[PDB]
């Protein structure tokens, strides 16, 4: 039997590294192989979170600056602060209560909370944990069925998702070592998607491969066509691919490389997010993942072209040890030290950071 | 007496490095280094590996693909994958069977097989192991004598040899320190050679020596005038090379530094395949090798300019533990990748891996 | 009950890192902690040291150098070399004598001592222990009420302070993970600031948010309004930072990232003084710390564009074994290395060292 | 007692690391620590050997070389190679024979020896030894008496000094703290410097602060006036030094940072060679040192624009082990070396490496 953590309040912790290696005790080891490592020789993944020191916050003076304020206003939507959850599977790996633990913790804090298509949980316990004034956004695996991909839409629409997230950089699965070293497969069904996967002993190559490979910005229009919800693409680290997305009807763009889990001797997110800032010019909103563990690098984001910064592993450690007081401990880490960040920089707003000029470090 | 390894049949491995430590089981000690170890502080020898990284691979999205195919045409050939098996001296070192396993391995894979002028076995059994329809190619360590040379030339042509590789970067043996320090000397015959070298009992450098130091554009005209055959100048990472070598009337460049075995201080072989593609401008085709460890790797240097990529050590290691069997696994382990990162960086086709554009890495 | 050194005399040490381990053995856990570590993951505090080796100094022969002079006259002051000491808190931390042998050192050594705001001794004990004749200047912590900092700089005045320092990088303090580890609170009171904050008991992070957080340009034309004295602005790293200063009426910048205990992810300090160097155009004096632990280190800074080079954490660990003996023996330490880099580059004064060219490291 | 090595013999080595090793057996432990260690934190004594893979040579085909020559024509003599022994102070540290044994075995391999004027044995010894052709140079370390500086020049004539070599680099020793922790002192007396320097008992600081500290073109004159000899200046890393030394009439210029000795966070020598280089314009002769462990080091150099690459540390270690036997057997290590590097990167000649061209390694 798969048992994961248990318990249900605040647990001690310095910085995103000890809570790391504290959640080992508590979360199996195949899981915790699952939800730790990544794809080949961990170029990429070291990489992410190295990237943040590649630009070199000014901590500027005389700015006239207290109590920053990390309020964003983001569509119809008051955020505590411009950090979102990520869209991670299997939630029921980290801790009993899964996503309807990390959705409660997530409303709480009160920001934007991405539902995973491979959840351990129905959208529908997703959207109730969370309450209804929750932001949640659907993340999508799409079906090769276009009619398993209208239900899953329809059902995103009854549970008020707010934006559709189609992952494109996981078509197929990266070259996941650790996980063939263990033997992982999901302990969990998937019932989001349980029209084409039962997720149950099924491998992680097993699962993507099980989800539609042929993405093309015919998909961006399906899901404009059947749901009238924004669509973010996400996985995008290059020109071509905002262009690509556009050109179909997106309306943001979410800058990943799905925390080093993908493709082995790629480039670090935080270094394609020059890049995609300056092919978007502003025409839609960017969110931001990969390596972030601390708020120098949620700022060094939003100087270099976010408007979000989303959050993956540390938010799963902190559920997997303290439950919804776990995850939204976690979320109040990272405000925490955004508000120190903004304060030594001499930024009053988060609009304010959006303008901070960052110096690119010639002896990296 | 010299024992190598036995066993014929499937081999357990995750990636070529755990590969290359469980082959330390089965090769001699003597042997092992010979095969493993490379020329002075080994400088050259690690840049080769780490200078994949120097060029970043952009995982594209929305690229409409699936199922992408590695088959690989080249001249009137058909082969599984743009990836084949280098000229490796003494197989006997590594195998019993030796290059007869070796040579029915990759004929069994389905793709170019180079043999080596110091193999255990003649050229006869080479083409009798891979059988009439395996593309064989011929490498060639030329006399002093052009009487044996044009000997060497009709065997090859008797056996059906598709082209001719003029290894021109061994003139001599490398400063190869543990060697030396195994005071190491070949344990078997290398028949191809016979009328000037016995290999019994030699050392590595008095075998080199043994070859034509003096190797100029004169040699490439001799083979064209003798064997009819397409020659290829192994060892090119210079534009000058490039010009001297099709000058003299080379239909091919293969672009290596001997797995960084020769000359320690000079530049990685995929750094140098740069301004070899940009020399040759498309005018005959590039073979690349040195440093090969992944699917990335193989992806990189195409996209780089190179039609084919040649694999050492590895497919040394797999032929040590498993034979035919254990060589063809090694090559679908490589193929496998390449199918997974085809797929991640939107590739359908060789073709379109050929239109890829690598980000130079400015953080190396 | 907090113990500290008590050693008045010569102490034994080669270079500042067998100091700074020395001093493990005489200052309390805590105490050692709060000096001697730094800000989140430490990126910014290791890169002040590597930083001088960013530009090279060149061993300049045949120029007609002997017995090189450290004398430098600044403003109407004689100093014994272009070495000062940082205003650095609590020095009850490192000796039982506290600010009374560290003024008794440097007034004997023969330089400017900056007092800091939160002292464990009053100014008007520092004034006596220097003596009248000893070049002191005031380093300010402002409070929120302006009644309180007329007092503050009235106080200055009285004990005959040269300059005002305006610390402007520590509006509040940085993410210091080792106080957090040890619990640690200050053990002793802070006269200077008794106004506003009693010290005893508090942490780190208290005593910063206790002093002004909203400093602006308006805060550099109140010192002058109210003290008449010369505005030095301590935490200048950029231009924009450098022209808000002197837009305000500052007669001094002083280069700093408060030894990397403040913004990590920040730059260097020394990379950071070529900026503030272009934009100063030696319009005002400049003043740079953090890092600094060897004689060719303060050559480098002056020939960037320093008039003065200011000492922390050495001087402090200096103080805690030998006492006014220990500090004026670190003192002697970088003068007598300034020395030997002077004869070694070939400047015979000061003034010929601001002279002098470093060649840019292209290889870090 | 100061005892030395005694063995007059063959010495079994691999390459200069296992050789420097093996020379803590014989050397005492003051000794092998005033040998081996350099200045400061050893950043230039460590990038002196890393400095040569800035540059990469690249193992050219198809150059219709074999047999290549190390023979070198300089002025009116004929060297074995393009490789001279650097002056070294105080063989007798190393070898009981001192420099008879190295005077004695440079001479039997055929090439330039430079006598320090802190050696253990007369110049009339070193004469004695290498026998009447054996080409010499005197190294002067300079008085600040002139009577004492006209005697040691016309002591360097009578000897048969082909030139004078002016070390303009040690005007004061670095600060070598190997030597500090050791309490190192010489143990013989230093009979060519005898006028002024005792040597027995006396501190490295000490001797060199005996000699003359306020070197300038006045030097270079005076040793032009009074000996009739071509000068070189020895420590030139810069263009402005060229100009320097040329203007005042030196007919050779010696590129080297003293082994790392001297002036720490300084270029690495080769890095220094390629300024040297361009600003000299092959007016004179350049001799280059620092950090030379491979023959890759001496062609690399040779192709940056040296006529001679001069040997120190190696050389002292083989005299330690063999006496005249074992300091021929490292320049034989050397030569061998050279030979491999010219026949694999092409060159049938010194004056062909002088023609090389070396790629930039961008990714260092
Ligand atoms: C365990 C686990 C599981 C998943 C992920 C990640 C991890 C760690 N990620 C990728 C995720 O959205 C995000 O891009 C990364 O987690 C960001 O990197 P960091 O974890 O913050 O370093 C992911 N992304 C997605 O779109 N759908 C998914 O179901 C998952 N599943
Ligand atoms: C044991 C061994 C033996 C040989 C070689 C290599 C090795 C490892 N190589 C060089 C070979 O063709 C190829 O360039 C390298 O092996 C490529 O580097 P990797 O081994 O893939 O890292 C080689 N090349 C050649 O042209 N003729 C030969 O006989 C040999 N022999
Ligand atoms: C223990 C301790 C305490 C303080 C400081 C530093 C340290 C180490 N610093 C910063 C100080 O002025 C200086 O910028 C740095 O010490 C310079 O870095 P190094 O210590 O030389 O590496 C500091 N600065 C300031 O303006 N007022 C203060 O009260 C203190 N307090
Ligand atoms: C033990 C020892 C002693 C001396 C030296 C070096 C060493 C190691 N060197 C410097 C020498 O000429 C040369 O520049 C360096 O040795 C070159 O560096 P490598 O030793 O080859 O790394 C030196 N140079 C000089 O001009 N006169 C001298 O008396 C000495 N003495």
């Not at 080949?40 to 990237?51: I, M, P, S």
């Not at 979410?254 to 270094?271: E, I, K, M, T, Y």
């Amino acid at each position: 039997v798969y048992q994961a953590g248990t318990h249900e309040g605040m647990i001690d912790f310095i910085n995103m590294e000890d809570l790391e290696l504290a959640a080992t005790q508590v979360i199996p080891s195949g899981g915790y192989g699952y939800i730790s490592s990544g794809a080949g020789d961990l170029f990429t993944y070291r990489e992410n979170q190295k990237a943040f020191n590649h630009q070199l916050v000014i901590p500027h003076v005389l700015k006239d600056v207290e109590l920053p304020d990390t309020t964003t206003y983001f569509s119809d939507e008051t955020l505590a602060a411009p950090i979102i959850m990520a869209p991670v599977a299997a939630h029921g790996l980290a801790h009993e209560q899964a996503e309807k633990a990390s959705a409660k913790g997530v409303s709480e804090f009160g920001t934007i909370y991405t539902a995973s298509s491979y959840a351990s949980c129905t959208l529908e316990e997703i959207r109730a944990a969370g309450g209804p004034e929750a932001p949640q956004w659907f993340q999508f695996y799409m079906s090769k069925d276009d009619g398993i991909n209208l239900d899953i839409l329809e059902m995103a629409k009854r549970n008020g998702a707010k934006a559709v997230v189609l992952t494109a950089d996981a078509t197929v699965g990266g070259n996941r070592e650790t996980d063939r070293r263990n033997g992982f497969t999901f302990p969990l069904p998937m019932p989001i998607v349980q029209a084409y996967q039962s997720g149950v002993g099924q491998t992680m190559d097993a699962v993507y491969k099980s989800s539609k490979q042929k993405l093309s910005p015919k998909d961006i229009e399906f899901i404009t066509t059947h749901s009238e919800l924004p669509v973010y693409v996400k996985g995008v680290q290059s020109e071509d691919d905002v262009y690509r997305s556009l050109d179909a009807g997106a309306q943001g763009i979410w800058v990943s490389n799905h925390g080093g889990r993908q493709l082995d001797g790629g480039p670090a997110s935080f270094d394609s997010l020059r890049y995609v800032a300056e092919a978007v010019d502003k025409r839609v909103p960017i969110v931001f993942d990969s390596g972030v563990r601390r708020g120098q690098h949620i700022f060094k984001a939003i100087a270099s072209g976010a408007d979000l910064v989303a959050i993956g592993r540390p938010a799963i450690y902190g559920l997997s040890l303290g439950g919804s007081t776990g995850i939204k401990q976690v979320f109040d880490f990272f405000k925490t030290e955004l508000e120190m960040v903004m304060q030594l920089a001499g930024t009053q707003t988060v609009e304010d950071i959006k303008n901070a000029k960052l110096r690119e470090n010639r002896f990296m």
